[PDB]
Amino acid sequence: TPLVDFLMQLEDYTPTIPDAVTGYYLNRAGFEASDPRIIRLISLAAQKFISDIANDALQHCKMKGKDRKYTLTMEDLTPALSEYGINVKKPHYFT
Amino acid sequence: RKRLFSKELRCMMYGFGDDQNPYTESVDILEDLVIEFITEMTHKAMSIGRQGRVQVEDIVFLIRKDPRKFARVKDLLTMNEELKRAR
Amino acid sequence: NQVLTKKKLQDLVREVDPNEQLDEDVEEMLLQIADDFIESVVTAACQLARHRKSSTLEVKDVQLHLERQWNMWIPGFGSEEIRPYKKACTTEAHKQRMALIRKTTKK
Amino acid sequence: MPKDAQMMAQILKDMGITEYEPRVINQMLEFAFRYVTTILDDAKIYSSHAKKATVDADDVRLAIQCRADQSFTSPPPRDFLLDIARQRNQTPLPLIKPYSGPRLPPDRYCLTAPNYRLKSL
Amino acid sequence: VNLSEESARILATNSELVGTLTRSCK
Amino acid sequence: SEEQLNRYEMYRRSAFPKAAIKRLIQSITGTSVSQNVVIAMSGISKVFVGEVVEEALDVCEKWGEMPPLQPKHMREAVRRLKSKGQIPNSKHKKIIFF
């Protein structure tokens, strides 16, 4: 069982998102998470998604060439979000 | 449009297990797929990196997610550098 | 005058998992979904054709509705060579208003 | 306050909204910027499909109408909800068995299930 | 000169072996 | 054997010609590309053909048909590849949150 094998590997990884934060957002979604390994798997999936978006943004920033400190500006996050299903469109210069 | 990949694609399908004599309609589907793939990659490459220029670096970022294609690009570039050095 | 005939649909289920049946309700609903998809695609393509000031539905505007909305590329038909992709037609008024956001920010 | 945030407070005041959060006007200007730059997105796809130079008004008129079905789909109309009801409202009400305990649907429509969990080995 | 004539011999045999008859399908 | 050695010969020696893809890419950019672009773009498209034919022969082996590849196994090949995100379409603005 791939999911069971992944849970066995997880029996070591601790996610950045705490269990009370994830265990609350499952409560608004419709269930109280009894087993504290399901909370861990969902938190790890969310952490992977955020990390991938941020790393794609960092790669665009590194490609533009400035090489000392990388600022998470909207010019690097907005093309990095469109590869997934997040399409932001922020205005400028309100007349 | 005519078919610019009619004879080349029949050697490639034989290379991946199809037949020595594939069907013309199947060769046509494969040719259309290849043209669409090249066009999509070229537009994304023009958007990413230097606007209006398609470079090897942009192509490599675009293919980074898929393992089989990324490995082939790296191998071809390294082998090309080695052949230039041998010459 | 029906387009799907409950034997082509049954083989569409047999090609996925041959030990699987549909119920009468599921079969009727699948036929209804097919009919609705055909109607929507045809109406949108016809509106694009009316827009090209033409009276013939070509395959170039059944392409543009399925790609943009339904995420479908039907391969074996072929198109004309796509024109050189215009990247940014940023106008002068945007080049001078966005050159005021930076003028206040650093100076 | 720009001239379109001074007009966004007038629109909410014209409705039954007298007390709103001040973050709302910053939100209703991001929606109004995302909408016109999505209509003009589709109005540039349709100008090149008819192979014209500029974006005319008949392109924007199509781009408005061809994204009122997916971006802003509607609740069902009154002529459809009447026909669905008046065939549902014609079958009679069934009778009730005298002693059936908890009255519930069949077991494939309820949420009563053995509801397992993993052995924490 | 050796690279110029030998390049077309990898492709000339790719028109004699594969694809002798042309087929079609309903 | 004697067919595996002929098939391995066609798996390696076959390629799209560089004189046509450099004509094909430059009709999309407008000005010019480089030789190391055409070398890579001719190589990814061979992997992509090998992504379809190796998977269209999985469609044919799943159903009850033989090695000759009908277009039924080829439209199904693009359908299964697109559901795993392998076939990129830059004209469908997708949305994951609903």
Å between A85 CA and nearest CA of chain F: 4
Give me the sign of the Cα torsion angle A10, A13, A16, A20: positive
Q: Does A86 touch chain F (CB under 8 A)?
A: yes
Alpha carbon C14 to its chain centroid, in Å, reads 27
Torsion, CA D66, CA D72, CA D75, CA D78, rounded to 10: -40
C-alpha distances in angstroms, D110 versus A34, A94, B48, F6, F79? 21, 53, 51, 62, 36
The maximal CA–CA distance of chain D, rounded, in angstroms, is 77
What gap in Å lies between CA C6 and CA C4, rounded to an integer?
Answer: 6
Q: Which residues of E touch B (CB under 8 A)?
A: 14-15, 17-25
Which segments of chain D does DSSP mark as H helices, in order?
A: 8-14, 23-49, 57-65, 78-88
Phi, psi of E23 (to 5 degrees): -105, 180
Task: Work out the number of other CB atoms within 10 angstroms of the CB of residue A75.
Answer: 13
Tell me which amino acid residue B26 is. S
Q: Which residues make beta-bridge pairs with B23?
A: E23
Q: Say which residue the tokens 């004879």 belong to.
A: B7
Beta bridge partners of E23: B23
Query: Experimental technique used?
Result: cryo-EM
Smallest CA–CA distance, residue F7 to chain C, in Å, is 26
Token pair recorded at residue B49: 């990196």
The structure tokens listed for C71 are 């995420």
Contacts (Cβ under 8 Å, ≥6 apart) of C42: C57
Buried b (16+ CB within 10 A) or exposed e, F18-53: eeebbebbbebbeeebeeebbbbbbbbbbbbbbbbb
Chain F residues near residue C82 by CB distance under 8 angstroms = 27-28
- F 8-27 residues with CB < 8 A to A: none
Contact present, D41 and D61 (Cβ < 8 Å): no
Place of tokens 């924490």: D120
CA distance F4 to B65: 32
Cα separation, D8 vs D14, whole angstroms: 10
Contact F71, C76 (CB under 8 A): yes
User: Rounded to 10 degrees, what is the CA torsion of B8, B11, B16, B18?
Assistant: 110
Measured distance CA(F31)–CA(F39) in Å, rounded: 18
Q: Is A29 on the interface with F (CB under 8 A)?
A: no
Q: Which two tokens stand for residue F39?
A: 């070398």
What are the chain E neighbours of B24 within 8 Å (beta carbons)? 22-24
* Spatial distance between the Cα atoms of D110 and C12, rounded to a whole number of angstroms: 31
- In this structure, are residues C84 and F29 in contact, taking their beta carbons and an 8 Å threshold? yes
| Three-state helix/strand/coil letters over chain C | CCCCCCCHHHHHHHCCCCCCCCCHHHHHHHHHHHHHHHHHHHHHHHHHHHHCCCCCCCCHHHHHHHHHHHCCCCCCCCCCCCCCCCCCCCCHHHHHHHHHHHHHHHC
**A48 interfacial to chain D (CB closer than 8 Å):** no
Give the contacts of F95 (CB within 8 A, at least 6 positions apart): A85, A87
Neighbouring CB atoms inside 10 A of D97's CB total 8
* Contact between F39 and F18 (Cβ < 8 Å): yes
Contact present, A19 and D101 (Cβ < 8 Å): no
CB atoms within 10 A of CB C99: 9
Inter-chain residue contact C85 with B28, CB threshold 8 Å: no
- Residue range(s) defining the domain that contains residue C51: 5-107
Please check whether residue E25 is in contact with residue B25, taking contact to mean a CB–CB distance below 8 angstroms.
Answer: yes
How far is the alpha carbon of C28 from chain D, nearest alpha carbon, in Å? 17
Read out DSSP for F35-59? HHHHHHHHHHHHHHHHHHHHHHHHH
Cα→Cα distances D86→A18, D8, D81, Å:
53, 42, 9
Residue B23 three-state SS: strand
Q: Say whether B61 and A79 touch across the interface (CB within 8 A).
A: no
User: For tokens 């909800």, what's the residue?
Assistant: D81
Interface B:C, ≥3 CB–CB pairs < 8 Å: yes
Question: Amino acid identity of C14?
Answer: R
Task: Give me B81's structure tokens.
Answer: 């550098």
Three-state DSSP state, E23: strand
Cα(B6)–Cα(B8) distance, rounded to whole angstroms? 6
Q: Would you say A54 and A72 are in contact if contact means Cβ atoms under 8 Å apart?
A: yes
* Helix, strand or coil, per DSSP, at residue B5: coil
Structure-token match 């293919």, residue found: B63
Give CA separation, F3 vs B7, B20, E17, F6, in Å: 20, 10, 12, 5
Quick one: DSSP state of residue B66?
Answer: -
Total domains in chain C come to: 1
What are the backbone dihedrals phi and psi of residue A60, each rounded to the nearest 5 degrees, phi first?
Answer: -60, -45
Asked whether the beta carbons of F59 and F80 are under 8 A apart, the reply is yes
| Lookup result for tokens 């392409």 | C63
Whole-angstrom distance, CA of residue A62 vs CA of residue B57: 12
Tokens of D105: 């649907």
Chains C and A touching, counted as 3 or more CB pairs less than 8 Å apart = yes
Chain C residue numbers with beta carbons less than 8 Å from the beta carbon of B51 are 87-88
Chain centroid, CA A48 distance in Å: 5
CA distance F21 to C46: 35
Could you tell me if B17 and F53 are in contact, meaning their C-beta atoms sit under 8 angstroms apart? yes
Which secondary-structure segment (H or E) carries B78? Answer: helix B67-86
**Tokens in use for A32?**
């109280």
The DSSP call for residue A37 is T
State the Rg of chain D over Cα.
26
User: What is the token pair recorded at A56?
Assistant: 């794609």
Contact predicate A40/A10, CB 8 Å: yes
Nearest to A89 among D4, D33, D117 (CB): D33
Instruction: Return the closest-CA partner of residue F63 out of A74, C37, C17, B80.
Output: C17
Tokens of B6: 């009619």
Rounded distance between C-alpha atoms, residue D63 and residue A69, angstroms: 43
CB pair distance less than 8 Å for D29 and A34:
no
Q: Pick F13's closest partner by Cβ from E14, E23, E25.
A: E14
Q: Helix and strand tally (H, E) in chain B?
A: 4, 0
| Torsion sign over Cα D70, D75, D77, D82 | positive
Q: Distance (Å, rounded) from C-alpha C7 to C-alpha C9?
A: 5
Copy the structure tokens of residue C102: 């930076």
Helices (H), chain F: 4-13, 18-29, 35-62, 72-83
Which tokens belong to F50? 């090998």
Contact with chain E for residue B2, Cβ under 8 A: no
Q: How far apart are CA D27 and CA D22, in angstroms?
A: 9
The answer to whether the beta carbons of residues F54 and B16 sit under 8 Å apart is yes
Which chains have 3 or more CB–CB distances shorter than 8 Å to chain B?
A, C, E, F
Residue with token string 């990324």: B70
**CA separation for the pair F54, C42 (Å, rounded):** 34
Q: Which amino acid appears at position D34 of this protein?
A: R
Q: Considering only CA atoms, which of B55, D82, C95 is closest in space to residue A63? A: B55
Distance CA F53, CA F76 (A): 11
Coil, helix or strand at residue A58: helix
Asked if F65 is an interface residue toward chain B (Cβ–Cβ < 8 A), one would say no
**Using CA atoms, how far apart are residues A68 and A65, in angstroms rounded to an integer?**
12
Task: Give me the residue label for tokens 């359908």.
Answer: F79
Q: Does C76 touch chain B (CB under 8 A)?
A: yes
Tokens 């066995």, residue? Answer: A8
Closest CA to B27 of B46, B3, B50: B3
**Beta carbons within 10 angstroms of residue D3's beta carbon:** 9
Residue F23 contacts residue F42 (beta carbons within 8 Å):
no
Residue with tokens 């590869």: A83
**CB distance F79 to C15 below 8 Å:** no
Any CB–CB contact under 8 A between A87 and chain F? yes
**Which tokens hold the place of A10?**
């997880």
> Phi and psi at residue B23, in whole multiples of 5°?
-85, 145
| Token pair belonging to F63 | 């159903």
- The residues, any chain, with a CB within 8 Å of residue F54's CB and separated by 6 or more, are B16, B17
